[PDB]
Amino acid sequence: SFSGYLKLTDNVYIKNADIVEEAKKVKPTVVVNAANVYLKHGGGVAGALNKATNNAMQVESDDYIATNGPLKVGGSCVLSGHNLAKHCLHVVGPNVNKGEDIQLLKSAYENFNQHEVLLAPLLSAGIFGADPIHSLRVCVDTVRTNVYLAVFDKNLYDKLVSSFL
Ligand SMILES: NCc1cncc(Br)c1
């Protein structure tokens, strides 16, 4: 199971780790992808997760979009986890660099409550442009299920832990 995590609350845990490496080791029931509405896994966590699946996540995602159309910002869909997890929960957090409503970050984290345990990144953090300290606060105040957060950047992980109220 999950190891080396620091407990933040009753249900939120955090570790300085590469989420792809964490997914390969653990093979969680659910790995969360930091998706966009088009499921175009080009960069950040999405590009890294997709590259780990040898592009199978993108092929599956393109078929999903061809059938269903784009997701909503704040929404999600459950697809295969391929070689990383049983399932991948593709969650769309608001992209601040695209002028999207930061208030949608709470709606995005609410998707986690449909799963008892998840391996996840901080939503809207990184290339999505939101403040990761704000994302962690929304996570602990929204998610009630067991969430194991993987933060790739060591310096950011340290900042998040040392500033956690
Ligand atoms: N080394 C794979 C990787 C690349 N980029 C971001 C993350 Br998170 C992980």
UniProtKB/Swiss-Prot annotation:
It comes from the Viruses. It is found in: Host endoplasmic reticulum membrane. Inhibited in vitro by GRL-0617. It is a multi-pass membrane protein. Residues 1-165 form the Macro domain. It catalyses: Thiol-dependent hydrolysis of ester, thioester, amide, peptide and isopeptide bonds formed by the C-terminal Gly of ubiquitin (a 76-residue protein attached to proteins as an intracellular targeting signal). May form homohexamers. Interacts with N protein. Responsible for the cleavages located at the N-terminus of the replicase polyprotein. Participates together with nsp4 in the assembly of virally-induced cytoplasmic double-membrane vesicles necessary for viral replication. Antagonizes innate immune induction of type I interferon by blocking the phosphorylation, dimerization and subsequent nuclear translocation of host IRF3. Also prevents host NF-kappa-B signaling. In addition, PL-PRO possesses a deubiquitinating/deISGylating activity and processes both 'Lys-48'- and 'Lys-63'-linked polyubiquitin chains from cellular substrates. This is Papain-like protease nsp3. It comes from Severe acute respiratory syndrome coronavirus 2 (2019-nCoV).
